[PDB]
Design a protein around this nucleic acid. Structure first.
Ligand SMILES: [Zn+2]
Lengths: 129, 128, 216, 70, 82, 101, 24, 82, 216
RNA sequence: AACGAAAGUCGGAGGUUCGAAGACGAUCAGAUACCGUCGUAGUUCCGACCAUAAACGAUGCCGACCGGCGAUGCGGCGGCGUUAUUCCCAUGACCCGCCGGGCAGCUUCCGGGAAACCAAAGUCUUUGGGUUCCGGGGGGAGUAUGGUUGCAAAGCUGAAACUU
């Protein structure tokens, strides 16, 4: 059955982005996915989106300018300490100059360079580049 | 079998593309034409070339040949239609009423030159 | 086009589109032509919306007048109902015609004698003329196509919706394209009717020319 | 599809401990029956006494009589 | 692209698609660049100024060049708003 | 080498079709791998119907037809030329062959 | 050798072997 | 397609879809009132009701349970509420 | 050298001034003296393999020779051409012509702390042809090309100073291994980095601007 | 732990045809094989066992996403008409669409693949949704032994030495 909702949402983004489409519809809507897509939006990768409210777990309609090469998930959520962040950003990212790892820390859900600047580590969520 | 091979019906056509102002419908004139206009080795090729340009001039002046160029159209621009009243000038154009709803919602149909005809009953358009 | 009222439809153009049978499409629908149909009748025919036909025709005429040289816009017709319209349009505008059989390699084989290199391609019907539509993919040609409701939109860039099946509507659509290009470029003023009848662009059948030659 | 959750290290390691035995070098060098049937017993060389001198012919595309000793 | 002295070190900057914003490469031989001419508002004649749109070939192969030309011409005032 | 996608059958979505026996060699084939053929002719031949007709006591008696339903195995069709081997790219033609001009 | 008959011949061999081993 | 708006769907394509596959799911049943023609109880029925809805004047049946909509008894009068 | 293409008459006249205007509009290069015109003194080739391939007939075997050739100008430019013909010098000559016709530019990028001139591929690129999947990885300054010999030739020819490689599959068949490395380094000018996010201005085409020169 | 084709084994009833083994004929140098005549055990049923098949989609299961098209099976909804006949007649049979689930199809430069081909065997070096059994060059061999299941035929678990 459906496990780990964030993964199936990001595979929906990726399959509908590779076809060059302009808008996706994501279902369900966590509060994990709204902070994750906040992270991808603030870096200028997806633009605006809407959280459609039915009284069940909602849907999300995302605008897409294709700027997004890959949006992926890491499952299970491995504990990433601050010495294991360089070993993880060497593996998943395509460059030292761009690409990001999103990881869920005790200051909030954040990307991997902010977690070095805030001096904290936590569990990994996925990546986008 | 008397089928003409590649040289006697390609060389005859490249003889016909240029030099059309000299050729004609009689074989004995074109046979004598063919030595000023070419360098052909011996005459049996030249009689076969003359026989195909006589057969091609027998063909060509009543319509277009596929292999011949638009030097033919230089002959048809040198030698060669509408009606008086056009076939799109008809005075009643039958319109089945879905088209009339389209024209009403395109801000036309206040002007009436058209006449809407009765809609069809039955939807049997498919084949079994 | 353009949200301009000098370029809008008049009742004379709409009477030509009604009398020719441009608005009567086919009985099948390729799934990315359904932004042009108004509704499907009881007969099974889909009705082509004529305002979409006019706005795509004027956008096509904008694309055709946007080339400085008129000699490297090339027009294709392989089927018999559009050959005379292609030759009349090419004599009217100064385009280059290719009517009849289209030998493959005429855009990509450089050493063959008919090797052209045009800058735009206008074809008659995008299913029967798919050989220059596929050969437009190696030479970077944008391609304009007069498209029926059941006609595939692979490799065409500007689809002009019409009934490209009959004689009258093909001859009319090439006539309206010639008229919009010659008005936009500056040759004919917009206010007079153009002095060329659409019957110069229609197809003449051998039975139709033999019934015209034997008069009563 | 593999078993890839977070508390599943025992299934993965007791899988790869058992499917290592289908690898032929691990089975041939870690089961112990190879070292008992080998005439050296894991040495590099062995000293021995020549019983009888033989000649053996080569395999089929070659033709020779190879000189060997028992 | 741009090193620390501010220099632009790239060979060239490739075009991007107007429909999908993919990088039209050196050997995307099915990609187009299409001019669509403007007209003057009072006379309806071509006055020399252009609109330029580029579509990569992979959008063209799946039949989606027509609708993107219709949307891009609709949003820059060529197709009417009905 | 997969040769045919349907494997030369009509068994899609069931486990077992009950077999029939061939009419020419009595070889037990399944019901749908066998090549069914329905042969209708007149009972009297085309030749002898010209002189049957002078012997009938009934005026205007149209003679009956013979309704034979034939199953055939896959070996005895290519022996009996009912069904013959075709190209790799015209095997996707499953229109039955024309009997009309 | 067709592998069913190789199977059948090792079947006959094992049937004769278990015949000869349970006499004692 | 491929520029298609998912946030503003048209009502033709919102009465087309299955009742779970809309943006907001909404049921395809409705509440009626059945008027029996020889009595004066306005009686409230479901559209898709599964019991025989008995009226209390002249004790007749208004509707019949079927797999879809309940077929009302012929000659009564109904309208949809709200 | 009499040109036959429209691009050739723009190039054997000083109308196209660099090769990246031809690459920039994806204009198809169809004659090999344009690459001899632009790159000139800096073109060095090296022949990769000469393999005999044999066709069985009732006349015995009929043996061909199939040559691979790499070419390149070592800042940006790399080509690989395969031409199979009956004599070995004929196969090498045709492979050099086809290797000039397939030259693509390489986008080279940096490792971190980007001072200076670009020394590696900008990102991890992967190319696949046959069964060989050849991955090219950015590297530090001054590590050399860590690879097999056949892509070391292709990566040292393109002007890439540093790379790390990982290759999967049956690499011994040389054609797929060099074609997969050529698919790996022809792909760096299709990869959308965050610095190529800037919105493009469109300039006039070479055939659009030089079209009143060309009609003479 | 339940079911598991056919053959097989045991107890009983039944036995028309087919039919291993077998007895004869004839084809061949020879056929103790195909080809004919007859036939036991079996095929058939009721109880008790055995658990293997090219048990095949040679493709584990649950969920997601990703182009089209025209029919077909079932259930539902909405639409010109046409037909009952024996009451505008009831309800069914057809016609044009829509939604869900299902057996399959044709096409496609989505994508994959070594290719055959596949709308999954796709979304995979731009590599992690969950989970179960299993493969590691070819033979040796599914053999030897050991274990256990079975009245028996056998089943499951099941290796080396050596060789290439
Ligand atoms: Zn048979």
């Amino acid at each position: 059955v459906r496990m780990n909702v964030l993964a199936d949402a990001l595979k929906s983004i990726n399959n509908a982005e590779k076809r060059g489409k302009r808008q996706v519809l994501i279902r369900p809507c966590s509060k994990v996915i709204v902070r994750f897509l906040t992270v991808m939006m603030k870096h200028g990768y997806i633009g605006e989106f809407e959280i459609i409210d039915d009284h069940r777990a909602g849907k999300i309609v995302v605008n897409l300018t294709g700027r997004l090469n890959k949006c992926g998930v890491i499952s299970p959520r491995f504990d990433v300490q601050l010495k294991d962040l360089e070993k993880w950003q060497n593996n998943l990212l395509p460059s030292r100059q761009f690409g990001f790892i999103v990881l869920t820390t005790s200051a909030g859900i954040m990307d991997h360079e902010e977690a070095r600047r805030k001096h904290t580590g936590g569990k990994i969520l996925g990546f986008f580049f | 079998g008397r089928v003409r091979t590649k040289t006697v019906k390609k060389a005859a056509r490249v003889i016909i593309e240029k030099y059309y102002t000299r050729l004609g419908n009689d074989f004995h004139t074109n046979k004598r034409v063919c030595e000023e206009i070419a360098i052909i080795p011996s005459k049996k090729l030249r009689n076969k070339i003359a026989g195909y340009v006589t057969h091609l001039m027998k063909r060509i002046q009543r319509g277009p040949v596929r292999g011949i160029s638009i030097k033919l159209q230089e002959e048809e621009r040198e030698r060669r239609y509408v009606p008086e009243v056009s076939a799109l000038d008809q005075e009643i154009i039958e319109v089945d009423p879905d088209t009339k709803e389209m024209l009403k919602l395109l801000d036309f149909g206040s002007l009436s030159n058209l006449q809407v005809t009765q809609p069809t009953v039955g939807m049997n358009f498919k084949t079994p | 086009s353009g949200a301009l009222d000098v370029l809008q439809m008049k009742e004379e153009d709409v009477l030509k589109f009604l009398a020719a049978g441009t608005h009567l499409g086919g009985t099948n629908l390729d799934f990315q032509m359904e932004q042009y149909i108004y509704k499907r009748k009881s007969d099974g025919i889909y009705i082509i919306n004529l305002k979409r036909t006019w706005e795509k025709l004027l956008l096509a005429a904008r694309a055709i007048v946007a080339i400085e040289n008129p000699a490297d816009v090339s027009v294709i017709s392989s089927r018999n109902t559009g050959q005379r319209a292609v030759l009349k349009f090419a004599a009217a505008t100064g385009a280059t015609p290719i009517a009849g059989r289209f030998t493959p390699g005429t855009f990509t084989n450089q050493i063959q004698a008919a090797f052209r290199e045009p800058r735009l391609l206008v074809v008659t019907d995008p299913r029967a003329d798919h050989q220059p539509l596929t050969e437009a993919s190696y030479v970077n040609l944008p391609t304009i196509a007069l498209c029926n409701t059941d006609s595939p939109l692979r490799y065409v860039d500007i689809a002009i919706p019409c009934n490209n099946k009959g004689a009258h509507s093909v001859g009319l659509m090439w006539w309206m394209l010639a008229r919009e290009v010659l008005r936009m470029r500056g040759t004919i003023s917009r206010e007079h009717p153009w002095e060329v009848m659409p019957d110069l662009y229609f197809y003449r059948d051998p039975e139709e020319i033999e019934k015209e030659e034997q008069a009563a | 599809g593999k078993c890839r959750g977070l508390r599943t290290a025992r299934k993965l390691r007791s899988h790869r401990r058992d499917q290592k035995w289908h690898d032929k070098q691990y089975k041939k060098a870690h089961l112990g029956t190879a070292l008992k049937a080998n005439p050296f017993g894991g040495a590099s060389h062995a000293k021995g006494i020549v019983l009888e001198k033989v000649g053996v012919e080569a395999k089929q595309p070659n033709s020779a009589i190879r000189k060997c000793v028992r | 692209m741009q090193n620390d002295a501010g220099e632009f070190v790239d060979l060239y900057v490739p075009r991007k698609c107007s429909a999908s914003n993919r990088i039209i490469g050196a050997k995307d031989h099915a990609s187009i660049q299409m001019n669509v001419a403007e007209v003057d508002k009072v006379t309806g004649r071509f006055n020399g100024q252009f609109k330029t749109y580029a579509i990569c070939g992979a959008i063209r192969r799946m039949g989606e060049s027509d609708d993107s030309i219709l949307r891009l011409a609709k949003a820059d005032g060529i197709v009417s708003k009905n | 080498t997969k040769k045919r996608r349907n494997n030369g059958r009509a068994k899609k979505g069931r486990g077992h079709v009950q077999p029939i026996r061939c009419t020419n060699c009595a070889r037990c084939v399944p019901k749908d791998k066998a090549i069914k053929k329905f042969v209708i002719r007149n009972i009297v031949e085309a030749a002898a119907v010209r002189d049957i007709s002078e012997a009938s006591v009934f005026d205007a008696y149209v003679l009956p037809k013979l309704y034979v339903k034939l199953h055939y195995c896959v070996s005895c069709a290519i022996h009996s030329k009912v069904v013959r081997n075709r190209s790799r790219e015209a095997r996707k033609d499953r229109t039955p062959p024309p009997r009309f001009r | 050798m067709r592998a069913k008959w190789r199977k059948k011949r090792m079947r006959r061999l094992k049937r004769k072997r278990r015949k000869m081993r349970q006499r004692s | 397609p491929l520029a298609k708006d998912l946030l503003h769907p048209s009502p033709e394509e919102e009465k087309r879809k299955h009742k779970k596959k809309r943006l907001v799911q909404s049921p395809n049943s409705y509440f009626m009132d059945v008027k029996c023609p020889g009595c004066y109880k306005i009686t409230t029925v479901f559209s898709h009701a599964q019991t025989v809805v008995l009226c209390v004047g002249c004790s007749t049946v208004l509707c019949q349970p079927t797999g879809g909509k309940a077929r009302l008894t012929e000659g009564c009068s109904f309208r949809r509420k709200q | 050298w009499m040109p036959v293409t429209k691009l050739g008459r723009l190039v054997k006249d000083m109308k196209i001034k660099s090769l990246e205007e031809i690459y920039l509009f994806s204009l198809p290069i169809k004659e090999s003296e344009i690459i001899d015109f632009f790159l000139g003194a800096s073109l060095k080739d090296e022949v990769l393999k000469i393999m005999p391939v044999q066709k069985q007939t009732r006349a015995g075997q009929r043996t061909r020779f199939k040559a691979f050739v790499a070419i390149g100008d070592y800042n940006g430019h790399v080509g690989l051409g395969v031409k199979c013909s009956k004599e070995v010098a004929t196969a090498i000559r045709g492979a050099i012509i086809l290797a000039k016709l397939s030259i693509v530019p390489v986008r080279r990028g940096y490792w971190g702390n980007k001072i200076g001139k670009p020394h590696t591929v900008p990102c991890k690129v992967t190319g696949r042809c046959g069964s060989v999947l050849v991955r090219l990885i950015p590297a530090p300054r001054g590590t050399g090309i860590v690879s097999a010999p056949v892509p070391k030739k292709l990566l040292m020819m393109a002007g890439i100073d540093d790379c790390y490689t990982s290759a999967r599959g049956c690499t011994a068949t040389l054609g797929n291994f060099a074609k997969a490395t050529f698919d790996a380094i022809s792909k760096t000018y299709s990869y959308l980095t965050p610095d190529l996010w800037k919105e493009t201005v469109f300039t006039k085409s070479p055939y659009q601007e030089f079209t009143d020169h060309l009609v003479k």
